[model samples]
Target: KITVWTHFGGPELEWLKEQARTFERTSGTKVEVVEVPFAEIKQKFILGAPQGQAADLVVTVPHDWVGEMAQAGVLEPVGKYVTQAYLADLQGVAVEAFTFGGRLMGLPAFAESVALIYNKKYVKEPPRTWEEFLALAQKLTTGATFGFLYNIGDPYFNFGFFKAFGAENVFAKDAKGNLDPTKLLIGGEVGEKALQFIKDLRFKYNLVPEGVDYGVADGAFKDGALAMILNGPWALGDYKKAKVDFGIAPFPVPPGAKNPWGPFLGVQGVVVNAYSKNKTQAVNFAKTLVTGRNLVAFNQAGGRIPVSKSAVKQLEKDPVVAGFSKVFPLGAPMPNIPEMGKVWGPWGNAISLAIQRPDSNVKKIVEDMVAEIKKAIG
Candidate 1:
């Protein structure tokens, strides 16, 4: 018997259970899937691995955990189980995201990134350019509704602007091409430009106000009091439940860039337990679990874009899913190193300050943020 841990709920849970039934009957291998609390899976796995009580396979882990889990010697090196040709066929960013140093630590399954999720009632067609976006936002902001909103103070959603303006956190690379924390950048001209652009959305254009957070913004969108929101697949189920008429589109191309605004890409995949006794069975089960049909089911049910080639073909038929796929090539892989821990506090605070203190000098904010990051990293 092979064991898998997943945090799937509702339709995701239903699909996983149904697939386990079908997988066991055909493969003659008994499958066991357990529901673990979403917040506790990583901690539980880390503790259980050394004690030989962990699940044989973990089906839904973020690629960010690759560095920590692999360094702990708890993850089975997945490169040996899959093939070069097969890896080449998968999404390049997905594969690259899971690879730590030189080791392929997990099998990439699904990908997600921020996009323009707009209410069809309010926006007949999503804005293609930043100029159009600003105009629409201004026009839409009359009395009861907001023209645009996002997780304003958060770095994850705000990185699209930073990247578009060429202000990168990973300014240097090590010998292995991994991001070097020592050479942390973001103190220069591009950083100031990004800060000013985001600030102008609130202060200059009066689009988003100070103190607007994710909950407030999300609640507004759900209640039909907002027009466009920048979010990912994670919000799809909620919007569907709220009965909101919405459509997904690519990020608006701001004037700062010659190309479209692309954010960081996130990939979630499965990793084998090094301590599990049934290594072969575990690997096979994990592989079978991510089949094209299974992936398509997850995509329809859970809203994550598929990374498998066959599954990609299935997702391409829909314009909504196709928009996300089109953006994937434009998005950069999020830095997977452990050094990323040092980025959030300073980076997030910088955006928060940009919105809250419009009178503050953006260049000085950039410098202070960089200095704080350098101090923390050292």
Candidate 2:
């Protein structure tokens, strides 16, 4: 018997349960799916898996949770069980998101990343470079019609700028490309420039105000007052419902940046519990669950962007799918090390502090943030 736990509700849950039933009928492998709250799954799984009290598989989870779970030894490495051709069928970024210390922890299912979203009514054509973007932003900003705005205080949103300026990864990887907690690079030279650029958007450029956040920027764009925003697929539904004509494009390259602006890639995948009595059966079920057809159905039911190469082609006609596919290749997967848990608060606070006053000392702010993060991680 194989048991799975999921946080899905309504139609998505129904689809999953039905799939489980169909698998049980055909393969003679009994399957049971349990509903768990999304917030409770991680803690509950970590505590219960060793005692044999948790489900055998977690149907889907964010890549960020992989580090902590893998560190705790509660997850099985799914890569060894699958063939190389199977791994090749999935998007490299999606697969890389679940890989930790060169070991594959899960079967990646879907993905999303932030891109340059603009109002078609205002932007005749999206800008392609720092100079053009800045010039257009300046020309568009007039009496409440802001040209560009996003959550300045969010480290998640600001990762693209940091990466473009050369703060490639939050934690440096070892010789084997595994995350090394010993080297923290957020307050490095390039990171400082990235943070300062974000501050300059409000201070020097005067394009955006001090207090703009995700909600504020999203609401403004939905209401047709803002020209551009840096966001992902999740926000498009609301904008369409609000009747805002919008388009998606890659983020314009910043000046003096050798690499393209890379947004954070978010992936969700299925993981098998290390302690499952039916370990082989669970892994088989996982492979079936992520097949191109099953993933296509999942996307049809839930609006998730599929990650398999075959499933992606089936949805090629979808403009949203085609638009984000271009952006995903340019993004860096979010760091999945356990030390990453300590980064959000301090990094976010730095943005909050730096943008609080016009003459805020960005250098001191960046250094202080790195110090606090180092202490927290230690």
Candidate 3:
């Protein structure tokens, strides 16, 4: 028996069941599909795997968790079974995100990128640069309606601006080509400019209300109180429910900027538990989930852009999926290094504080962030 744990919706679940039926006929094994809440998956796996209650295979977000699981010896490296030919079908960014410390930890299931989703009624032509975006926002702000909503409290989202100014990752590789935690550059001119840009939207332009947090901003957009927002696919549900006429485009690049900055690309995928009794069956099942007809049906029903080449071709016809493709070229896969987790909490807080108190010493705030991140990375 092969047990696969997932957080797919009803339509996605039904499709998985169909795949299970097909696999059983060909593989001569009973495959059981279990639905789990995505929020509880990590906790459940941590507690259950050591106690022999874990599913043979489970889907998860690519991050330091993979490294932790690999270190704990609770994850099986899939490289032995995943061939280069099979891998070529997946997006390179997705494959790299799922790899850790020179090991292919898992096979990617889907990939996502942040794009500027706006109310089409308000924004007919998307802004091409930060200055132009501000101008458009100023024009759009009218009677209880604001211009934009971005997660000012989140440094991960703020990374879009850092990239625009050609800033490297906070704990990037040094001249010797090795990861150096002390080689940090989080708060610098780039960081200040990024924070200042957000402040201008709130204070100078008066495009957003004072004291508006990310949660409030999202709610405002959903209720039509805002005209535009920098968000990802996760918010697609809310927009659909509100029946708002909207469109998505790449995040605006700064004027005369060579690179159009984009937020991190997050890839989610499945992995077999190292301690699973049915390791062989689980590996085969994981492969089945990503190949042939199953991949198409799975990604389509889940509202995720497929990871396979053929699947991408099929999605080209989908209007919503097609919009996402436009942002792919600009997407930067989130850093998969284990140290990345430590950088977010403090750095994100700094961004929140800087945006909230624009009159404060911006340079000092950025310097403090750089110092803190250096310490955390080390």
Give candidate 1's TM-score.
Answer: 0.83
| TM-score for all models, in order of appearance | 0.83, 0.77, 0.80
- Sort the candidates on lDDT, descending order: 2, 1, 3
Q: How large an RMSD does model 2 have?
A: 4.3
For candidate 1, give the lDDT of residue 320: 53
**Ranking of all candidate structures by their TM-score, best first:** 1, 3, 2
User: Judged by lDDT against the true structure, how good is candidate 2?
Assistant: 0.84
Model 2, residue 328: distance off in Å is 2.8
Model 1 worst lDDT run, 10 consecutive residues = 253-262
Better of 2 and 3 by lDDT: 2
State the displacement of the C-alpha of residue 5, model 2, in Å, after optimal TM-score superposition: 8.0
- Residues 1-378 of candidate 1 have per-residue lDDT tens digits of 888899776667777788778778878888888999865898788889989989998888878678778777898998987877778778878888898868898889889888889998899987877788888988998888899988888887877877777744355677986677777655577678778888887888888887688778888988999999998876665677688888888777666653457778889898999999999888888887677777887888768888888778766776557768777767777777765656777988987877787597888888999899888878
Q: Per-residue CA lDDT of candidate 2, range 64-119, in tens?
A: 88888998899999878999888888888888889887899999998878888999
lDDT per residue as tens, model 3, 1-378: 888887664556677788788889989989888889865776677678878888998854555356556666667789999888888888777777677778888888777767788888788777877788888888777777778876766777777777776656655677885556665555677777777766665677666566666678778888887778887765665666577777878888854434567677778788888889989988997888887466666555545677788778877877567878888767666666666666777788777777676586777888888777778767
| Per-model lDDT | 0.80, 0.84, 0.73
